[PDB]
Design a protein around this ligand. Structure first.
Ligand SMILES: *Cc1ccc(S(=O)(=O)n2c(Cl)nc3ccc(OC)cc32)cc1
Ligand SMILES: *Cc1ccc(S(=O)(=O)n2c(Cl)nc3ccc(OC)cc32)cc1
Ligand SMILES: [Ca+2]
Ligand SMILES: [Ca+2]
Ligand SMILES: [Cl-]
Ligand SMILES: [Cl-]
Ligand SMILES: [Cl-]
Ligand SMILES: [Cl-]
Lengths: 227, 9, 227, 9
């Protein structure tokens, strides 16, 4: 996308979202990141939405194929699960590469730095979901380390109702439950996050209250499923 | 369980 | 897909459908057609489902973008609508090329020949939806001619409840209403098709009755919207 | 209006 203006890439990413063309959306936002300038709050959200939709479709397909393969246990099911898995890994490596070149290193404000470190944790988590063996171990630690740095910054720099702080805690709890085999850590983190946010709701406007309570309900939904 | 959907914005 | 076995391409197209990976599904079925052998009834349905899903997503995106562009009337909305439109045209040209090389010419039974000629009409119709001017005229005539040959064969060779015959009549009626500016022809065709199918339902098994009445309901739904 | 959905098989 080197010959397209930054502002045109951002405009086309918004059009692609409206058209439900998420692969295009991700390609436009990759092009915008590769312009080298930092991203605004809205632009970070466009980047994240685009790639979450692309990898979300790949993960759903991988789970369908993995379930068929496990039931079967010719080469075709394994071959096709492997093709989807390689494509998914490639998308995760692309996102991680954007974060490493050079979004995280240039992110100084807590809102941008926590946002990017949460993304780093999420995309290592999606790598971990398909990883097998000792490879899994280093990938799992990379996810954990990114989430933990984001948690440490968020607890020092953001109020307990901040939606990025809340979504980070939600996703790190899912990491604990689903990836790290630490359901008790997942439940503790979700409960503490929910309770600390509850106690800070009185400080918020009506619109901020709606944003924070929406994510708190996701924490409660997981706690209900886990307990 | 569920992570942040994160698929609309 | 030249190095993959025909049977493996068909197996992977079925897996891709289960995984909702319709672009992959279409690529596998293109590879299977290019093996050069005729397609069975099930294989024809896989080909058609794959491409209908791919072009259906492109058409939906084109309509979103076309609506934004018409409301706006920088270059970005037009440029991006044009990109989607070119991609859609490319998929339609690919399907038409498979039908012309060499599915239709080798299709001798009425069920295969009508199926492929209906597809030819449908993909010219999708070209017509985005075409502008005198180009539109020749594309519209190509759709009409394919549908008409399919209609002529279906009326001679298939009972009025045959699901391919019914779906062909449904889609040709939509062509009349939406493309050819012939709403009265659309309504007449839908009514006559429905009534002739009704009169032949007594000949069918329970399972064939369910298949035919499902499509008859689509004809009735259009008649309700059109009258 | 509506053509055959044709998106499942
Ligand atoms: C990981 C995560 C994703 C989305 C959200 S949110 O509340 O739905 N959200 C979006 Cl989509 N964009 C946002 C910008 C800023 C905030 O809070 C400052 C939230 C937000 C939260 C977490
Ligand atoms: C154009 C068209 C598409 C689908 C149908 S159907 O009844 O839903 N159908 C499918 Cl998806 N596959 C089929 C094979 C054979 C028949 O009837 C012989 C119908 C059918 C009809 C028309
Ligand atoms: Ca510039
Ligand atoms: Ca062979
Ligand atoms: Cl494969
Ligand atoms: Cl900075
Ligand atoms: Cl473009
Ligand atoms: Cl033949």
């Amino acid at each position: 996308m080197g010959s397209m203006e930054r502002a045109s890439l951002i405009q086309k990413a918004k059009l692609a979202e409206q058209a439900e063309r998420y692969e295009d959306m991700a390609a436009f936002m990759k092009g915008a990141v590769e312009k080298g300038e930092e991203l605004s709050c809205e632009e970070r959200n466009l980047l994240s939405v685009a790639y979450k939709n692309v990898v979300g479709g790949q993960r759903a397909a991988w789970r369908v194929l993995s379930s068929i393969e496990q039931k079967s246990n010719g080469p075709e099911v394994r071959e096709y699960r492997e093709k989807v898995e390689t494509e998914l890994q490639g998308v995760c490596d692309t996102v991680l590469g954007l974060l490493d070149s050079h979004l995280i290193k240039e992110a100084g404000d807590a809102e941008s730095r926590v946002f990017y470190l949460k993304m780093k944790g999420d995309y290592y988590r999606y790598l971990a979901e398909v990883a097998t063996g000792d490879d899994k171990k280093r990938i799992i630690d990379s996810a954990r380390s990114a989430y933990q740095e984001a948690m440490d910054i968020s607890k020092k720099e953001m109020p307990p109702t901040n939606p990025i702080r809340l979504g980070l805690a939600l996703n790190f709890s899912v990491f604990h439950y689903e990836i790290a085999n630490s359901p008790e850590e997942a439940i503790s983190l979700a409960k503490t996050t929910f309770d600390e946010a509850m106690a800070d709701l009185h400080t918020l406007s009506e619109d901020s209250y709606k944003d924070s309570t929406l994510i708190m309900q996701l924490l409660r939904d997981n706690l209900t499923l886990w307990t | 369980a569920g992570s942040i959907p994160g698929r609309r914005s």
